[PDB]
């Protein structure tokens, strides 16, 4: 393997003997020059762990650090200071003072421009940090929400242009707003030029996706893989005009890039460098999981997936610092943990914190829970959960079996309860949401709608406030950063067109997408309605978390209630939190807080609380003591 300054002076042989003097002793150059040699060794080993002595390693190699270096050359003055400032920074991430959101640039405000007029309310929200949801070119009619990609660098012409966009983040951290957007790296759709050209026969884009001449192997595969999108096909291909089959983990018109070939990340690599050079903070990396693919086994998780986003980390370590990565792994716990690290992935969902926040507002019991935060939220130095509620996601019933069994609990069997619960096919069931990729060969299935929908607010359930107070409570409390899905803190409904929607009928997860709800945000300031409690509760926990020091970094200690349905942790040793799952008031014992302060003062209701004493708590109340 060739090493760091060896591949230094090749980059400079493009300059003519008068150009590489000046290159060599231009500030841009040190700062690479030392990036290089503190990271290099690290993208050297994860590449030749996954490419071995492939011939094409060491020439992509060279060709990936050639455009490393202009890339870097051409970043922008301002990206290069923030591109200092984190790399002396690395835990921005874990500060309470960050508070994230994330929306649609169509449905939340038409187009770019009509985005960048909303940031005064990002502001006034408190937002530090703001996804948008895929907004470059992708098929007319269905493309899965943007997913399906047809190009990584021209912008849908329905939002506006690469120079709107290039606008609106620029206008995003004149605010004090980090910008976050999406790396779907793990497919593109089957309109996009590579797609064409792969499947034309076209030599420059062989293998870079996996096509086979008939279903021999996809049989094979097929032994062992889960189905995603048990709706749109079975198994995980599916077959062209042609007759040829194509390795197809989601929709038919996604189809999955193929990383076994060097060039392929060296592609991917240079969309990387494009995205970072438009001033993205975080590149939200879709469907991680997937990247690599073994015969025999589920073809999730696999090693060589996780050394390749470690390769991705150290491009970016060497020509864009200030770009992190946020991990969307949406699989067992033991495996999503693995992809949350310095070196590979800085932040990630957490969907099993998630998953369990609405499993216990249908149980209204603690337990499993509990069980999470105790033994799987803490996390390695320099690295956070992205707490949520709600996503432009189906909701995927998260948790580790073996955990559950732990409990008495069978995780199939309480499943078939879960399910049928939030899409109210449970008697009492406050829930109005619906079902997303039944597998009747399975059993298993997904739910769709918005959280004040599962809640029950679309039937003004009198405690619908309260839950959605509750839950959010925990993702701005117990540490990490907490990504408010835009239209929550209104109460914002399902749309329920959506089934009548030739282009969005087959997929229920457009039922929690809806449009901009112009009534509930002009109610937002009047404390009568379900959209003012909302927003002014949420509003008030966003302003705590962020000006009470008590609330940094991500890690906890659980605290046990005794009662099954209050959950209770600290935060710092100074900061007790309970939450009231139960519809009804529930008590800790004056006996469970003898270990506490005599009085403290809460920061939810304001009022002095006496824990020498019975502590009872209302349906759904929150408390945020300060202990110390
Ligand atoms: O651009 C496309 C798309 O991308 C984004 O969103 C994507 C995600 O990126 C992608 O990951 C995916 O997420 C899906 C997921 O793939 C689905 O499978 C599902 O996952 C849920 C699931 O519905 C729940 O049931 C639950 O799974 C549990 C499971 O119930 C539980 O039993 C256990 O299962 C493990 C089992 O215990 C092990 O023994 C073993 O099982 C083996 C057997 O051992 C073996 O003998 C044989 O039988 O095979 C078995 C299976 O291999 O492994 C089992 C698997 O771990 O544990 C699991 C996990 O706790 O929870 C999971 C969630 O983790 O739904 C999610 C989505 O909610 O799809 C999304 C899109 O939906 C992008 O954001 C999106 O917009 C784009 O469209
Ligand atoms: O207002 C409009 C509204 O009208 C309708 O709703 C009505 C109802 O029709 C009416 O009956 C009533 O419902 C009240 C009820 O009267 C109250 O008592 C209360 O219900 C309690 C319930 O009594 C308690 O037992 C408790 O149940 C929990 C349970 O404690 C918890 O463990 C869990 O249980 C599930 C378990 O977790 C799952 O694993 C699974 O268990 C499986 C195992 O997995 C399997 O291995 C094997 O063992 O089989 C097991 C089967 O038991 O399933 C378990 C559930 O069966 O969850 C339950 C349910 O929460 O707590 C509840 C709640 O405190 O409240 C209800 C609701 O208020 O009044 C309402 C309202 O007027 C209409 O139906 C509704 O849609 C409309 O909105
Ligand atoms: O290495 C960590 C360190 O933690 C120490 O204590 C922490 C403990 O692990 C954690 O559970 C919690 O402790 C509180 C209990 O959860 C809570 O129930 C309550 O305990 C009462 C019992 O419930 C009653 O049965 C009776 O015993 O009275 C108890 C009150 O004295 O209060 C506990 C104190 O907050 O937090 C602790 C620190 O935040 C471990 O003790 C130590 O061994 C570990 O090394």
Not at 214 to 240: K, V, W
Not at 426 to 436: K, L, N, T
Request: aromatic share 12%; hydrophobic share 40%.
């Amino acid at each position: 393997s060739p090493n760091s300054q060896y591949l230094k002076t090749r980059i400079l042989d493009i300059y003519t003997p008068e150009q590489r003097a000046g290159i060599e002793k231009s500030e841009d150059w040190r700062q690479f020059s030392r990036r290089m040699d503190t990271h290099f060794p690290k993208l050297m080993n994860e590449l030749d762990s996954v490419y071995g002595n492939n011939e094409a390693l060491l020439p992509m190699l060279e060709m990936l650090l050639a455009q490393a270096w202009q890339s870097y050359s051409q970043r922008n003055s301002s990206l290069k200071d923030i591109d200092i400032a984190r790399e002396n920074n690395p835990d921005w991430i874990l500060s309470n003072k960050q508070v994230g959101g994330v929306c649609y640039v169509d449905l939340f405000a038409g187009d770019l421009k009509g985005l960048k007029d909303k940031i005064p309310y990002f502001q006034e929200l408190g937002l530090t940090y703001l996804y948008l949801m895929p907004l470059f070119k992708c098929p007319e009619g269905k493309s899965d929400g943007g997913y399906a990609v047809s190009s990584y660098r021209d912008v849908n012409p329905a939002l506006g242009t690469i120079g709107d966009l290039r606008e609106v983040i620029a206008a995003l951290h004149e605010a004090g707003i980090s910008a976050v957007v999406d790396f779907i790296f793990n497919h593109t759709s089957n309109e996009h030029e590579w797609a064409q050209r792969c499947a034309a026969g076209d030599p420059l884009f062989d293998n870079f996706y996996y096509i086979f001449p008939d279903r021999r192997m996809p049989d094979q595969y097929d032994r062992t893989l889960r189905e995603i999108f048990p709706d749109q096909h079975p198994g995980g291909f599916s077959q062209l005009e042609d007759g040829r089959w194509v390795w197809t983990t989601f929709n038919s018109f996604q189809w999955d890039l193929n990383y076994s070939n060097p060039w392929v990340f060296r592609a991917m690599a240079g969309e990387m460098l494009f995205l970072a050079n438009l001033g993205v903070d975080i590149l939200r990396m879709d469907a991680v999981a997937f990247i690599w693919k073994q015969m025999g086994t589920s073809c999730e998780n696999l090693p060589q997936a996780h050394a390749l986003i470690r390769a991705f980390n150290a491009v970016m370590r060497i020509a864009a610092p200030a770009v992190f990565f946020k991990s969307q792994a949406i699989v067992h716990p033991d495996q999503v943990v693995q992809y949350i690290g310095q070196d590979e992935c800085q932040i990630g969902y957490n969907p099993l914190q998630m998953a369990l926040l609405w499993n216990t507002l249908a149980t209204r019991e603690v337990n499993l829970l509990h069980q999470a935060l105790t033994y799987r939220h803490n996390l390695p130095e320099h690295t956070a959960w992205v707490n949520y509620v709600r996503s432009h996601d189906d909701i995927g019933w998260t948790f580790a079996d073996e955990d559950a069994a732990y409990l008495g609990i069978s995780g199939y069997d309480h499943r078939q309860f879960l399910n049928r619960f939030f899409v109210n096919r449970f008697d009492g069931s406050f829930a109005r949401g619906v079902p997303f990729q039944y597998n009747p060969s399975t059993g298993d299935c997904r739910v769709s709608g918005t959280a004040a929908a599962l809640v029950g607010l679309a039937q003004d359930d009198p405690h619908a406030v309260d839950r959605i107070k509750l839950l959010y409570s925990i993702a701005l409390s117990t540490g990490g950063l907490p990504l408010i899905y835009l239209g929550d803190e209104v109460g914002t409904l399902n749309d329920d067109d959506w089934s009548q929607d030739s282009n969005k009928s087959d997929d229920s997860r457009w039922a929690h997408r809806p449009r901009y709800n112009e009534a509930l945000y002009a109610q937002r300031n009047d404390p009568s309605t379900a959209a003012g409690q909302i927003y002014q509760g949420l509003r008030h926990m966003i302003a705590v978390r962020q000006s009470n020091p008590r609330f940094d970094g991500g890690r906890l200690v659980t605290f046990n209630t005794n009662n099954k349905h209050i959950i209770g942790y600290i935060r710092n040793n100074a900061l007790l939190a309970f939450g009231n799952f139960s519809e009804y008031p529930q008590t800790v014992t004056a006996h469970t807080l003898q270990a506490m302060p005599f009085k403290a003062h809460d920061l939810i209701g304001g009022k002095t609380v006496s824990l020498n004493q019975d502590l009872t708590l209302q349906p759904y109340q929150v408390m945020w003591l300060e202990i110390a």
